Amino acid sequence: MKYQVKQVAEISGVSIRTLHHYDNIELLNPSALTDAGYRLYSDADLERLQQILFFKEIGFRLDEIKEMLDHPNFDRKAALQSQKEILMKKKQRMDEMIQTIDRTLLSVD
Amino acid sequence: MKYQVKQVAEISGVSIRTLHHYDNIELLNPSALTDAGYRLYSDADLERLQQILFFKEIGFRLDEIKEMLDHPNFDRKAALQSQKEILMKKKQRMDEMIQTIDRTLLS
DNA sequence: TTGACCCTAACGTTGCGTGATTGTTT
DNA sequence: AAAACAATCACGCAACGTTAGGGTCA
């Protein structure tokens, strides 16, 4: 029924420290707590975690992920594209950086 | 032939705040200090600042840049390559992420 | 009692931006 | 006697990693 850090960390691949941090940030708040304070996660919490984890792969930030999960109305298409555009530019920057390196490695190679 | 922050900053493009930081980090230390504490950079300090800015463009971090300027024995060739390689892998990760977005935009 | 497991601090990391407050004078 | 310019704090940002010390018991 419920899961505690060790298990959630194992099922999802993230660290316990991560679960805490996501808890402190209000990104992912456990569904329950034991009298002793132990965090107890529900299957729903696990879906939520998978989604925040997926948006993480696309390069979004915890705040963006948060605002998108807490506010579903927020159009996702435009976000997925803009994020793409942002990514593409980051890629373009690195290219210019690599050129600068090559354009520099031409001297006693 | 000495310059104070306003100038050096204006001549190099970086901010005065940057110059201070680079000073605290021991990356770029002013050639001279004024009695009142104003720092004065020499033409040499300016060359050093340019070198710094180059490596900064290639993507190196202050520590790496520092360690390279303070020890000119460090083979620069391999450094420029390894850095190139690192930049490439980053490019690749960027690609996979873009693919994943596209692979999701099918709707 | 004892592992195995959980918690809360709180500093470390990268590179300055942005005030706030205050001294100096190229 | 003011306008510019310089200085030293020190908090803020992204996302956890990593001890350090100390309860709990699925």
Swiss-Prot record, chain B:
Expression induction or repression: Autoregulated.
Region entry Hinge, spans: 71-74
Positions of the DNA-binding region: 5-24
Coiled-coil ranges per UniProt: 76-107
Range of residues in the leader sequence: none
Residues covered by region (Essential for dimerization): 76-104
Limits of the HTH merR-type domain: 2-71
Subcellular location: Cytoplasm
Biological function: Global transcriptional regulator that activates transcription of bmr and blt by binding directly to their promoter. Also stimulates the expression of the mta gene itself, ydfK and ymfE.
Domain comment, as recorded: The central dimerization domain of the first subunit forms a two-helix antiparallel coiled coil with the dimerization domain of the second subunit.
Subunit note: Homodimer.
Protein name: HTH-type transcriptional activator mta
Source species of the chain: Bacillus subtilis (strain 168)
Encoding gene, per UniProt annotation: mta
